[PDB]
Amino acid sequence: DIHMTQSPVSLSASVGDRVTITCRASHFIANYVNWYQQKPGKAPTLLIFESSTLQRGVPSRFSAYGDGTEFTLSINTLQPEDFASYICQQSHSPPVTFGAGTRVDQKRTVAAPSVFIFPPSDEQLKSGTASVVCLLNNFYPREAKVQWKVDNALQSGNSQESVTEQDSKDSTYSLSSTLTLSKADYEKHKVYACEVTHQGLSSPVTKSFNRGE
Amino acid sequence: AEQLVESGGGLVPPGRSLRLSCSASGFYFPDYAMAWVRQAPGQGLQWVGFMRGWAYGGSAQFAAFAVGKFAISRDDGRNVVYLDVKNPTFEDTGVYFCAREQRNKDYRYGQEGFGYSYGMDVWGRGTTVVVSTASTKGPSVFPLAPTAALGCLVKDYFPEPVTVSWNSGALTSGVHTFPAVLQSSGLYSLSSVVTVPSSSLQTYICNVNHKPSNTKVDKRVEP
């Protein structure tokens, strides 16, 4: 199969910026590339086909070009409704294959998150499960590292993340991380910690609680 | 104008054959080759396969993983394309889009090579498929006990959506209700939070409503 490699993974830009997104094909595919836009919860929208033909009804600030191996999507100039993900696709031969996407969001100043930790309620444990929740509030950029620690033992594979869409008025993100443990496991240990690493923090921030107190 | 609409299920049992339907309107469907493209939670687009119109032989091709495990057929008089999944597993969870391949300037697909190079110009809204043994149900609401922050954990529900407000709408400043995330059980879970001055600990009540199960819950969040 032909593999499509999109860079960068993530891009921060301002209204009025000229934005350039790149897709690389593992094989020479001449002009057989399409570009799509996708916004959260929606189907993709075709922007470009045959690497540079603008799709009817798509605004002319979108253009694209390629050389058979490297293909470039250009937004000139970026508009508010253009903060979205962009996806390349080769149409050269089956199986059809897509790039992994490039996220374009709105640039703002670096903002560190406010971190909070929540123990599981007393009612949930009665049902046999314990959810521990870590909240990262109002930060930028979106990249954040959350490490769960239980009695100072690093956790892997038992948490789930959720990130808001970029806030409309202040361009920050908020993020939730939820650690799930059986009740029995939750009561064999004492100290529950959430450690947050972020560009805005001079060093990692840790919030924690001891069970029962 | 031109429109596709997928149907065929939220929670579906593993191992039982699954049929999705894509109904077309607003265009002459039998002229068009039709594709199925799926998107697992948090993942990128994955082409499942496509089928040509009758005038190009009506053959179908699939991604390597999908060969022999999925099937596509069309009923042109009913303006519908189908995707059949034999033996679905958790790996088949995601949103399934139906899409048509655009024809070129000359109302044609390409004459040389593959020929489907004018982009997928019409897409359905997508149908969420979750392969699991779980059943439809409303959510359990648990408090997230307390500048300070508190919230509500809205856990184990299907399908989307739920709506969450705070103090019946009177509290909006600092509220963040997070996108639902799918758990390994096949049920959704979500948290709603708000930051608040630690002196005010004012009363705090989250009001979660889940219409598909006729569930309304108001939970008091105290320290």
Numbering used by the authors:
A (entry chain L): 1 to 213
B (entry chain H): 1 to 52, 52A, 52B, 52C, 53 to 82, 82A, 82B, 82C, ...
Provide the authors' original text about this structure:
The HIV-1 envelope (Env) glycoprotein trimer, a trimer of gp120-gp41 heterodimers, is the infectious machinery that targets host cell receptors CD4 and CCR5/CXCR4 to mediate fusion between the viral and host membranes. As the only viral protein on the surface of HIV-1 virions, Env trimer is the sole target of neutralizing antibodies that prevent infection of host cells. The V1V2 epitope on HIV Env is targeted by bNAbs that make quaternary interactions that prevent opening of Env trimer to expose the V3 loop and coreceptor binding site, hence blocking conformational changes leading to fusion of the viral and host cell membranes. A new V1V2 bNAb, BG1, was isolated along with bNAbs targeting non-overlapping sites on Env from an HIV-1 controller who developed elite levels of HIV-1 neutralizing activity.
The BG1 CDRH3 length, 22 residues, is shorter than CDRH3 loops in other V1V2 bNAbs, but longer than typical human antibody CDRH3s for which the most common length is 14 residues. A 2.0 Å crystal structure of unbound BG1 Fab revealed that, in contrast to the protruding CDRH3s in other V1V2 bNAbs, the BG1 CDRH3 does not extend notably beyond the antigen-binding site surface. The relatively compact CDRH3 of BG1 results from folding into an irregular structure whose conformation is stabilized by Tyr100CCDRH3 interactions with protein backbone atoms in CDRH1 and CDRH3 and by water-mediated H-bonds involving other residues. None of the four tyrosines within the BG1 CDRH3 (Tyr100ACDRH3, Tyr100CCDRH3, Tyr100JCDRH3 and Tyr100LCDRH3) or within other CDRs show electron density for a sulfate group. The CDRH2 loop of BG1 is two residues longer than CDRH2s of other V1V2 bNAbs, and it extends further from the antigen-binding site than the CDRH2 loops of other V1V2 bNAbs. The combined effects of the relatively compact CDRH3 and protruding CDRH2 result in the BG1 antigen-binding site being more flat than the combining sites of other V1V1 bNAbs. The BG1 CDRH2 includes a solvent-exposed tryptophan at position 52B (lysine in the VH3-49*04 germline sequence from which BG1 is derived). Protein-protein interfaces often include surface-exposed hydrophobic residues, suggesting that the long CDRH2, and this residue in particular, could be involved in the binding interface of BG1 with Env. Unlike the PG9 Fab, in which the CDRH3 loop is ordered only when bound to the V1V2 scaffold, the CDRH3 of BG1 was ordered in both the unbound and bound states. The final model (Rwork = 18.9%, Rfree = 21.2%) omits the following disordered residues: Ser146HC-Gly154HC, Gly210HC-Thr211HC, Lys234HC-Thr239HC, and Cys214LC, and has 96.7%, 3.3% and 0% of residues in the favored, allowed and disallowed regions, respectively, of the Ramachandran plot.
